[model samples]
Target: ASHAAILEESMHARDQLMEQNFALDKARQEAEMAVHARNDFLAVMNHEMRTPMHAIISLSSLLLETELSPEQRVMIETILKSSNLVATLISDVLDLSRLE
Candidate 1:
């Protein structure tokens, strides 16, 4: 009688563990899909934003080479600096996405 009771207890525990494992697996799959989707979005933004940023940086630098009043020169310089900073940030974000 004791042996039968032990067998029944073990089977019950096994069923509980199996249910927990299935739940964990489902949660893991959802998290994986979420991360994948976020990374894809970041990748696309990196590409799209970088293209316009490149043009802005290039054109601003070219503008710097042209003769201009001191005030205008400073403005163009600021534009260049800001654009470069944004580009760096974009690259950093893309790099961070890989860590996850």
Candidate 2:
């Protein structure tokens, strides 16, 4: 009986700590959900950006395959190079989203 009382005394006020730990775990779960939500949002935004850049690259390639003045070819090449760079940037962002 004395051992039971001693154990009880040892555990005195532990309910508050238990409750606090429970609350902390719950908050941690909520924070994870928010992180996934934001990552998904970023993924969608990156997709939107990458699509238009793909279109620009496709159109420019078609123009480059046709006859054009030297100056016109240079301009189309510039567009192609710039679009490819932007597409790579979007790819990096997508990789970043995956990492997160």
Candidate 3:
């Protein structure tokens, strides 16, 4: 009877170890999925940001060649400044990427 009890306890301990191992594996998989999701979000955000930035740069380049009154030039300069600020924000995405 003592031997039977020892065998039962050993079986229970083995089952507990298996359960712990399964939990650990599940946690690791969840972490990996989260990383993948973050990478996908970053890629999509970068692509979306680039499209508008390209338009801004192209239009700004064209505007630079046109002659304008001082007021009109000031408006154009404001657009350039705003576009540059957006470009800087887009550049900050790189810093975020480095963090991952």
The estimated TM-scores of all candidates read: 0.82, 0.74, 0.77
User: What does the lDDT read for residue 35 in candidate 1?
Assistant: 85
Clashes of each: 0, 0, 0
Candidates 2 and 3: which is better by lDDT? 2
Residue range 1-100, candidate 2, lDDT tens digits: 6998987876775877898999999999999999888888888888788778889999999999999999999999999999999899888967676636
| Top candidate when judged by lDDT against the true structure | 1
User: What's the C-alpha lDDT at position 28 in model 1?
Assistant: 100
Q: Write candidate 3's Cα lDDT for 1-100 as tens digits.
A: 6999999999999999999999999999999888888888777787878889878867876897799888887887788878888877886865478326
* C-alpha lDDT values of all predictions: 0.92, 0.88, 0.82
Q: Which prediction has the highest TM-score against the true structure? A: 1
**lDDT at position 8, candidate 1:** 93
Error of 1 at 58 (Å): 1.5
- How far off is model 2, as Cα RMSD? 3.3
- Could you arrange the candidates by TM-score from highest to lowest? 1, 3, 2
Model 2 clash tally? 0
In terms of TM-score, how similar is model 3 to the real structure? 0.77
